[PDB]
Design a protein around this ligand. Structure first.
Ligand SMILES: CC(C)Cn1c(=O)n(C)c(=O)c2nc[nH]c21
Ligand SMILES: CC(C)Cn1c(=O)n(C)c(=O)c2nc[nH]c21
Ligand SMILES: [Mg+2]
Ligand SMILES: [Mg+2]
Ligand SMILES: [Mg+2]
Ligand SMILES: [Mg+2]
Lengths: 364, 381
């Protein structure tokens, strides 16, 4: 049994080491225990990261909370625990793997993580794990795991339009996003057997909670262009200055843009995966459409299964949302990739940047 | 009948006449009402909505209006400061500030039985009017729908206040602070609560004659006003306001810009929410009393919880003078100046449009609340 469990860990880490991690396959391998995918992946990553040790996190409470958090994810076509797991894997990968030419100032007193499943080929590379303190990256990983907690499979617009109690409760501002963060943090405080951050002083915990909220609320698309604008003003402005990883604010922004990219990574994966996710999103949209119909309301754009515009939807999405975000992130040179020759006065190859471009074509 | 209708009119004219003054004697009204004093807010709201014409503009049914505002009052807890009386005071302030004559204010704007949704309505106070063309009032630049939202927001900005600060709630990990992720915890609760109350029952629906567009906008405007009363964002609003209105490279206002209009409206409740040290000594002190008493009530609970008593909240070690001094210096002070610099403050010209004293925009103006502020400041230094 001991060896059997160790084999499973090495197996997973090997699978997850690919940006195009076959998450749907894992779902199958787990079979009936499929519902514990988010907690299992969280455990595996917190180990590979070393966070469990860095913050003396008791294994029991950790699993208690995340096993609970998982059950909070409804059984809907897209915004479910599998999505959360995917978003988690993405932020982990994006802040762990080698980034061509990334200058690592804080190159690992504040603790810094380092994935045991990869390392920079040489000084020509770098990674966020070396510029962003472990506390902050843990907030990101946790935020990712709870960012779509208890999603109803409906959009903020729908909630706001139908004057849903949840929308009235939050004054129509980031309705879902607020509810995700609040519901999850509430769950955490519900029982003492969930408190896995007990070994953090009131100071650290206060900040950790802040960071987690900031990350989750940044996943509200209505604020997409504001983050993007703000991120570029700091990172991609020849009259500005790089980032200054020694700055909390700058670092936070980097983290927010990172989770934003991870939440909508769909079209930046291999076609196989991209289509599987797309199928989920639209099926969920069509359900929302059938309701608007039943409520005698105008069906929202791209949500009418009788008059679909799947390609127009995806083409539009990539063009206006994921695309510009990816470029900004790429321009800041934070995207993991690899050099092409033996010489940023050199050609790099960004696998996800490539996937995005190819996918855009299938929707044109 | 007539002997009953003629008496109802008298009360109206009285209240209006009394409110027609920046230093409206609220507490005197509280007593004049005595046992029916629990309905100050609903009575003032109704009165002000007639003085402005809002009842007619949006064909607001009296029954549902009273129904809702009566219920809204009841939501205000019986605490030392954040109570229906404070609400009524703030409501009166925004009403006054956006209605009385303002020296040199541009009038750039629109100066039967069916509602014409094609035309943008503007309200006009019956209890006053611009002395001459040298004066302009805010109600002439900000559409009725927007001012009505400001007034309604004032009436609900502190709904169900617990008498505790946001910091307190965040620190004690109150269920409400968790719910709103420590962001404008109280302010969020006020708006969400009042709105939930409004949609609670059909007999509260007094806005039943606004089309979906108008309602949607009204709701948005109200929330924006209420949430601006969170002092944590005080300096941010002040900064932004200065950037537009009066700064080195300031632009102006352009009342045609919805955003600028909202900013002005927000800076208004902002001021009206803390008008205390800008009223006459009498009123200023009476308010100061309520605030400290409440601050102390908090300090007590902080103690019963084994928490460090928050600054100025320890009654067995008060620092009232220091408190007010600082507040009038770092908060209300800079706000009034900024608002004054933009020239949006009611007031009156000192001299004739001939101030070229060779024997020594250009003429002199006297702002009542501007001086009250300088005076009250003295009695704390
Ligand atoms: C689900 C939706 C709010 C955002 N979103 C997304 O994240 N991915 C990956 C898509 O392909 C997509 N297509 C439309 N909307 C989309
Ligand atoms: C009540 C408090 C949050 C703000 N506040 C206020 O509104 N007025 C009028 C004061 O004099 C005052 N003094 C300290 N804090 C104050
Ligand atoms: Mg989401
Ligand atoms: Mg998501
Ligand atoms: Mg308040
Ligand atoms: Mg108030």
């Amino acid at each position: 049994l001991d060896l059997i469990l160790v084999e499973e860990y090495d197996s997973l880490i090997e699978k997850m080491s690919n940006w195009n991690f076959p998450i749907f396959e894992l779902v199958e391998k787990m079979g009936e225990k499929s519902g514990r995918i988010l907690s299992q992946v969280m455990y595996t990553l917190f180990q590979d990261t070393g966070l469990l040790e860095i913050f003396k996190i008791p294994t029991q409470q950790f699993m208690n909370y995340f096993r609970a958090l998982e059950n909070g994810y409804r059984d809907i076509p897209y915004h479910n625990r599998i999505h959360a797991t995917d978003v988690l894997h993405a932020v982990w990968y994006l802040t762990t793997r080698p980034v061509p030419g990334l200058q690592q100032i804080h190159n690992g007193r504040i603790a810094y993580i380092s994935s045991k499943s990869c390392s920079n080929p040489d000084e020509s590379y770098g990674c966020l794990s070396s510029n962003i303190p472990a506390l902050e990256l843990m907030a990101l990983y946790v935020a990712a795991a709870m960012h779509d907690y208890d999603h109803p499979g409906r959009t903020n617009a729908f909630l706001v339009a139908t004057n849903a109690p949840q929308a009235v409760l939050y004054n129509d501002r980031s309705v879902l996003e607020n509810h995700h963060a609040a519901s999850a943090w509430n769950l955490y405080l519900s029982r003492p057997e969930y408190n896995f951050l007990l070994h953090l002083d009131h100071v650290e915990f206060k900040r950790f909670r802040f960071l987690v909220i900031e990350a989750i609320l940044a996943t509200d698309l209505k604020k997409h262009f504001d983050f993007l604008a703000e991120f570029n003003a700091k990172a991609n402005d020849v009259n500005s200055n790089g980032i200054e990883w020694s700055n909390e604010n700058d670092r936070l922004l980097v983290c927010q843009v990172c989770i934003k990219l991870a939440d909508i990574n769909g079209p930046a994966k291999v076609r196989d995966l991209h289509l599987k996710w797309t199928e989920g999103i639209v099926n969920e949209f069509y359900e929302q459409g059938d309701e608007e119909a039943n409520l005698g309301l105008p069906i929202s754009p791209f949500m009418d299964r009788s008059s679909p515009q799947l390609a127009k939807l995806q083409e539009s999405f990539i063009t206006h949302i994921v695309g510009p975000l990816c470029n900004s992130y790429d321009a800041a040179g934070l995207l993991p990739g690899q050099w092409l020759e033996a010489e940023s006065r050199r050609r790099i190859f960004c696998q996800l940047m490539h996937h995005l471009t190819e996918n855009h074509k299938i929707w044109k």
